[PDB]
Amino acid sequence: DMYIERAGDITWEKDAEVTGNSPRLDVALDESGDFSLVE
């Protein structure tokens, strides 16, 4: 029996940590809403 708890405001932070890469990926989306990698 699920419940919610507030965790913060939705705000852009100046000088947040900047990270992660930017990959271009071929994918398919099935009727169950699962993404899969094509090739």
Binding site: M2, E5, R6, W12, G20, F35
Partner: protein
């Protein structure tokens, strides 16, 4: 109960202790999360009962107490931030340039940041603070890191 615009954890007591199953956004009296987090179930907000209003398993989204309200888009150029809310850890902004999910229906934003599954439903923002979509539905690549979409709903 609490209806303040902002970001929230989704918890269950049905397992060992209190377990965070995901994250969502409260905006204009409506709660937004991913379908896999709640599976369409009712939520509590203290003494309050939030009922599902709209949901679609294929989009992997669900809204509570009204129609989907978020209609901002990754503009394809500008950076973004994952306002990650990880299980038992403080909300933290992470800035990233999203990559791209090319599909037969079109192209979607993608972010290659590996957080625990209970981070599902954390919002992705643009530089004006607008929610451009939610984190947690994509693919695991060779590298072992999950790549999530930028999953965003249609406002009616």
């Amino acid at each position: 109960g609490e209806t303040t615009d902002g970001v929230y954890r989704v918890m269950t007591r049905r397992l060992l202790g209190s377990t965070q199953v995901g994250v969502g956004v409260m905006q204009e009296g409506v709660f937004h999360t991913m379908w896999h987090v709640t599976k369409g179930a009712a939520l509590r907000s203290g003494e309050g009962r939030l009922d599902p209003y709209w949901g679609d398993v294929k989009q992997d989204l669900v809204s509570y107490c009204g129609p989907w309200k978020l209609d901002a888009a990754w503009d394809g150029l500008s950076e973004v931030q994952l306002l990650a809310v990880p299980p038992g850890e403080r909300a933290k902004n992470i800035q990233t340039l999203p990559g791209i999910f090319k599909t037969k229906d079109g192209d979607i934003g993608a972010v290659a940041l590996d957080y625990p599954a209970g981070t599902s439903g954390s919002p992705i923002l643009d530089k004006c603070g607008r929610v451009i979509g939610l984190y947690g539905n994509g693919v695991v690549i060779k590298n072992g890191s999950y790549v999530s979409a930028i999953t965003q709903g249609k406002r009616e």
